[PDB]
Amino acid sequence: MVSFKRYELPPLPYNYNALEPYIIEEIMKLHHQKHHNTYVKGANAALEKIEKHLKGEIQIDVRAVMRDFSFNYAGHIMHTIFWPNMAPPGKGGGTPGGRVADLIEKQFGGFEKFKALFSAAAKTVEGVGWGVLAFDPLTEELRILQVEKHNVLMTAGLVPILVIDVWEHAYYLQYKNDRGSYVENWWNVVNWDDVEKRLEQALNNAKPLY
Amino acid sequence: MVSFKRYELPPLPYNYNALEPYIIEEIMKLHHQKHHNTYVKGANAALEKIEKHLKGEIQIDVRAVMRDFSFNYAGHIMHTIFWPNMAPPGKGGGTPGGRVADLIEKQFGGFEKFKALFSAAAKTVEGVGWGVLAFDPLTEELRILQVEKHNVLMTAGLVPILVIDVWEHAYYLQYKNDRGSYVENWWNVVNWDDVEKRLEQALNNAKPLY
C-alpha cells in the first residue's frame, strides 16, 4: 500500500483582475483562494480517512467519507476546468471557430441558438451549481446539462469541455442577486481556444475510452 | 441541424440465465428488457424535447428536461458498463491479475482489503444506487465512491471501470431485502478481464482530457 497522490490547487492562468470588468478581482481572489483551496483540502482529508481505515487505524462511515470525497473532488475538478475556460477579454470572448463551432452548428443549429440554450441552462440552475457543455462518448456529440452543487445531476461518461459556475459566490459581490446579468457578461471572457483544445482531446480519447 | 444520434439498448453479452445461480434469469430479463430499455427511451425522449426547442416548435423547461436527460443518460451508461462487467461463472468470478490487481495492491493494500471496502460502499448506498470503482484522471489512481439514483454523487472526470447496481430491482426477487447477500454473491460473476480492458483504456486516454 502506497499513500494516495494528493490533489493540488491549480494556479490561475491569468491575473486576478484580468477578467474585469466582467468578473471583478475580489470575486476571482475569494473564489480561487478560499473556495477552490477548500475543495482541494476537503478531497485530501477524505482520502486520508479512507487510508487510516484501510490501515485498520480507524473504522469510518464509508458512505459519509465518500460523500465528502464526492463533493470536494467534484468542486476541485469543476473549478480546474472553470479557470482555463476563461481568459482576458480579447483572448477571451467572442464566438468560437474550428471544431467547436462545427459541432455547435450541427447539434444546436448555430452559436446564437447554442448560446441561448446554454445561458438558459446556467440561469435556471435551482440553487447553486453549473451550466455544462459536455462531450458524450456514446454518440461523440455535444450535450448541455446542469449540475447542482458540484456532484448532483452529473453523470458518468459525459466530458465537460465548457462550464460556468453559477454558485452565488461566483457573482454576488458584483451582480448581487442578478445571476442573469452575470451569465450574459461571462460570455465576454469565454476562452474558445481552451474549449477547442478540450473537444480535440475528447474526440480523440472519449469514445475509445468507453 | 443534424438530428441527434439516438441511444440504443445494447444486447447482453450472455443469455438471461447465464449468471445463475448468483443472479436469477427473471431478474436479468426484467432488468435488461424493462429497466434498461426505459433509460434508452427516456434519454432519447429528453433529446427529442431539446430538439423541438431548438427547432423553435416548442418552449421547454430547460431545467426539467435536462434533469430527465441526466437521469436517463446516467441509467443508460451505468447499465452499459454493468452488463459486460459481469460474466458466466468461470469467465466471471475469482481474483484479478494484471494492472487492476497492481493498483489494487498500491491503493487499497490488496484484493481482500479492496473487496471489503467496495462491498461496504455497495452495501451502504442510501436508497438506490451504485457501488463504483473509478479511475481518477487527475491522479491516475483508483477511487471508490457511491452513486445515488444514477446521477447523484457522481462527479466529472472519474471513469467508472467496475460497477454494481444496488437498486432494489437488481436483487429483490431473489435476495429479497438482503442486499448484503446479493453483493457478496455478485463477486462470483465479476468479469475481471472486462475491468482490466477498461482500466487500460483509462490509463491511456483519461488524463489528457482535463
Add this chain to the structure above:
Amino acid sequence: MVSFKRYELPPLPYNYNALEPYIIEEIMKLHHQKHHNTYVKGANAALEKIEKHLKGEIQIDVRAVMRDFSFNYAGHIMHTIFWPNMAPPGKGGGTPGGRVADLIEKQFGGFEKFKALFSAAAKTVEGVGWGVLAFDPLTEELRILQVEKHNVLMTAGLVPILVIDVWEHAYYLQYKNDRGSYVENWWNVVNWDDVEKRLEQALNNAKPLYLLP
C-alpha cells in the same frame, strides 16, 4: 441532560395478509419487519451518536450523522403514516366523504381528477420515493407532491395525510417492474377514514404552528 427519546416500531393495524389481494403478505412482512424496523434502528443509532458527541465522549461528523438521522427519521415517520393509511378491502378502498371530499372538489375539481393527478405523481417518482397528499398550513388547502428517497423534495409545513410508498420493495415481489399496476391496485386499500381523521387534526392544529395565533 437526559438526552433523547427512542423511536419504536409500531405494530401494523391489521394482519400481514390483510391487504390481499392488492398487496401480498410477503411484501407486508418484509416491508414492516425488515425495512421499517431498520429505519427505527437507524434513527436511534444517529441519536445515540449525537448524545455521545454532546457528552464530549466522541466528536462526530455532524453533517453525516444528521443526514443519517434525516433519512431514517423520515423513513420511520413516512411508514408510520403509510400503514394506517391503508385498510383491508371494505374498510379500505372506495371514495372519500366528509372534509376530504370537500377539499378535493375545491382543490382538484373532484375525485377522478384528484386520483389521476395523485396517481401520475406516484407513478412518475424518479427512482424511489413517495406520492404525498398534504395539508398546507399556510393556506389550509391540499397539495400533492413527490418525495424522493424519504427526505428529498419534502418541505417544512406540509402535513402528509395520505402517502403511497413507491420504493421498489413496496411492489416488486408482486407487480415486478409494473409500478403503474401497483399504484392502480393500491387505491383499493386506501383507508379514507384514516385520511379524514388526519385532515380533521390538520384543520384544527397545523396553521398555528407557523402563523402564530
Add this chain to the structure above:
Amino acid sequence: MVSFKRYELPPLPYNYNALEPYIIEEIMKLHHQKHHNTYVKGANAALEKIEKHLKGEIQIDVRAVMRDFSFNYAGHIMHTIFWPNMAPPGKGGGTPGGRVADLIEKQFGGFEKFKALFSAAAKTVEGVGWGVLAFDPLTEELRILQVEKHNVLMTAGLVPILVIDVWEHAYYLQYKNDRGSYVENWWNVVNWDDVEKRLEQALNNAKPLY
C-alpha cells in the same frame, strides 16, 4: 373547483437596517425583496400550472412542476419562519428561558452545548441550506438537523421552530466566504420570544397531526 389561495410575501417584522451591525441593510433588502419574493412567485406559478392542467388547458410534466412547487414553497415557508426568528439586537440575542430553555437543558445538556451543536450544523451545511431546530411530534422533543437547498434532507413531521439561512446570499456581501463568522454573529439577533411561542404551539398541536 376553487382557484388556489395564493402565497404572499410577508413584510419583515422590522426595517431592513434593524439587524445591524450583525446583518447589513443591503443583505436584508435583497434577501426579502428579491429572493423571498421569487419563491412566492415560483410557488404560485407552479400552482397555476397545476390549475391549468386540471382545467384541461395545458400539458404539464407532473414531476417537474411538483419539483418547482417543492423548492419554492419550501423557500417561502423557511423564510417566513426565518424573519420573525430574528429581532433587532436587544429584543434579539441573549439566552432563552421558559420551555425552550427547559428542553435545551434536558436534551442538549444546556444552552452552550446546544449552541455549539446548532452552530456546527449550520456551518457544515454542504453547499447552500439551513440549520434547523425542530420539534419532533413523535417524541415531543427538540431535534437538530440540516436542510440543503430548501427541500433536501427536510422530513415530514418535524416542525422548525428556529432556523438559520446559510445560503450564500444570506451573508456573502458582509462576511464574504466566512460563513462561520456569520453564524456566530447571527446569535445576537435571535428572537427567543418568537422561538418560545413556536414551541408552545408545537407542544400543544404537533403530536395529534400524526
